[PDB]
From a paper:
The Gly52 residue in C0 position was replaced either by Ala (TmArgBP20-233_G52A) or by Val (TmArgBP20-233_G52V). High resolution data, extending up to 1.64 Å resolution, were collected on TmArgBP20-233_G52A crystals. The TmArgBP20-233_G52A crystals contain one molecule in the asymmetric unit and, as expected, the protein presents an arginine molecule in the active site. Determination of Ala52 main chain dihedral angle values (φ = 117.3°, ψ = −170.9°) indicates that Ala52 assumes a conformation closely similar to that of Gly52 in TmArgBP structures. This conformation falls in the ε region of the Ramachandran plot, and is considered to be strictly forbidden to non-Gly residues. Since it has been shown that backbone geometry may show a significant level of variability, the local valence bond geometry and deviations from planarity of the peptide bond have been compared with values detected in well refined protein structures. This analysis unravels the occurrence of significant deviations from average values for both peptide planarity and bond angles. Altogether these findings demonstrate that the significant destabilization induced by the Gly52Ala mutation is caused by apparently minimal structural perturbations.
This protein is endowed with remarkable biophysical and structural properties, and presents a helix insertion motif located in the D1 domain. The helix insertion motif is locked by two consecutive C = O H-N H-bonds, made by residues Pro40-Phe53 and Phe41-Asp54. The Gly52 residue, which occupies the C0 position of the motif and presents a well-defined electron density in the crystal structures of TmArgBP variants, adopts a conformation that is strictly forbidden to non-Gly residues.
Residue numbers in the entry: 20 to 232
Write the structure that this text describes.
Amino acid sequence: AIDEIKSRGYLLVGLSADFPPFEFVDENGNIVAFDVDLAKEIARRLGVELKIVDMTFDGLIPSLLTKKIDVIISGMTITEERKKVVAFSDPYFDAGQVIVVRKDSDFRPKTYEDLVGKTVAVQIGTTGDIEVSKYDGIKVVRFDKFTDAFLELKRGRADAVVLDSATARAFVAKNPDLVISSGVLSSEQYGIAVRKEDTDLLEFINSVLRELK
Ligand SMILES: NC(=[NH2+])NCCC[C@H](N)C(=O)O
């Protein structure tokens, strides 16, 4: 809780920095982008310093539950399944899943059904993984890091990547060989995850988000 954060002198924020425009590693090795700046605002308003801890996305809730981080600010969708294990702030971004393919491939899937019979790369433990995993006949290939999922697609070892719309746009801008084939397939909102007992921290973060909006 806040007493504990004040006592070490800094907020510990967990994320996976493979997710522009929310968090990524720049060419100097620094972790930057929207969530980083959100983290900084929260810390400044709390009156403490900030430490970002980059890890695998699917390790973030494990890290939060074991108190190795205070909060997750990592483009994380608020889900009923996750609301069983953690608390979320008010939402701060709307997105949904899309399908990315190679422009040179002779296919342009529009729906999850269109990926039946195809090999689809996802980042493990994302809402994208969760969705494609429900469809029998999609062969899912799962990666800790989105960079590796895109390398799989570029190299032709997968047919498609499924991931959130804003990040899909960022990866396709970097990779003119790739294209978003589908419209948006889900209605998701991002929130900041806090341990359920840390009601003080949740409240404070909600107040910061409200002032920002
Ligand atoms: N920093 C990241 N890699 N974030 C992945 C988030 C994907 C999706 N919004 C989810 O919550 O599962």
